[PDB]
Amino acid sequence: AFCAPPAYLTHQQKVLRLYKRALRHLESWCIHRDKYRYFACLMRARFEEHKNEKDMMRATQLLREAEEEFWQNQHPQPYIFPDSPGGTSFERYECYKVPEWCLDYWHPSEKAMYPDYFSKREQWKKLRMESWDREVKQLQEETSPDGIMTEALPPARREGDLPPLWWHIVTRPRERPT
Amino acid sequence: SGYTPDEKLRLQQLRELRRRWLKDQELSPREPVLPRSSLFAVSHVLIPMWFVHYYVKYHMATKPYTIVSSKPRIFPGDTILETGEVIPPMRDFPDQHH
Amino acid sequence: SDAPPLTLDGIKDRVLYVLKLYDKIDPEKLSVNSHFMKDLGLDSLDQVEIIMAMEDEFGFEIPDIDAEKLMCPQEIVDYIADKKDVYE
């Protein structure tokens, strides 16, 4: 959620994702903790005994048939964490995540109700306004002439400025603004 | 392949800014700067009961068929207090085993 | 009422607790700045299992790409802090 995906997943990444998903579905099948630990050790043993192959085509065929087996006998109703996609209370507090620019539209009476907070907010707005030009200059100076450009962003390179495009993720709403 | 120092340093600086912003989200101590047993049962039951009973007695019984009840289930062996019409009981009840 | 808030020290202590109960590593050698493969001697399956244990400890799911980015208990703690908005 915090790192943008690359162009493709490597074979190691696909194997690790399958391993994690298989362990989660195994837990969902064998609910009980000791039984889950037993079968998770068995699954780890299977991955270890197919670990070292030195043949990319054989490894890819093993991965393909392992994904086939996973889709054949996955749990139809797996365990999903709350605050995770597909689970309960996933997008529950999005109705309370107010996007923080409405404080500009707040009345002077309401701003007078919280004076110190709005002084600090004005200081933050001044910092953003002063940092934006150096952010744009650093992004233009980033060596991306043509071709391969990823979704990653650079940090603050010189002393005294801020990472580019910092505002939308520094001033994001809290995960439970209640 | 964990964090390259590029995004590691970016995450560290963004983390420092996020900690400062969340710390600034705290409220000052002065903020926000603002500018008996049975009384509820008397106020919210008795007065509405008075109004409702006025509407029932003097605006429904004054109308013909606004309140209609069924028969009060007369049984054999009681007195009707309207005309003196006590009704006779049933017959000899031949079965009396249970 | 319910749900006491969690701080950086509590997050660090719980992460260190789980890693000390891994039983594969750390014979009084673990620190907060110990890399899982560089100076703890693990591999990718072990790191995936460590992430699974952290998820089961804290009751929420770390997404796969961020999870495979995480390689040290310090940055596990930093990830929990960034997700939960700690030090308000």
């Binding site: 107010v98 996007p99 707040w106 009345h107 309401e110 919280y114 907070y117 709403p173 209640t178 | 989200q25 | -």
Partner: peptide
């Protein structure tokens, strides 16, 4: 303590 400023829209109008 630890009271946090909840962000709300302008309900004044």
């Amino acid at each position: 303590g630890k009271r946090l400023f909840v962000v709300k829209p302008s309900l004044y109008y």
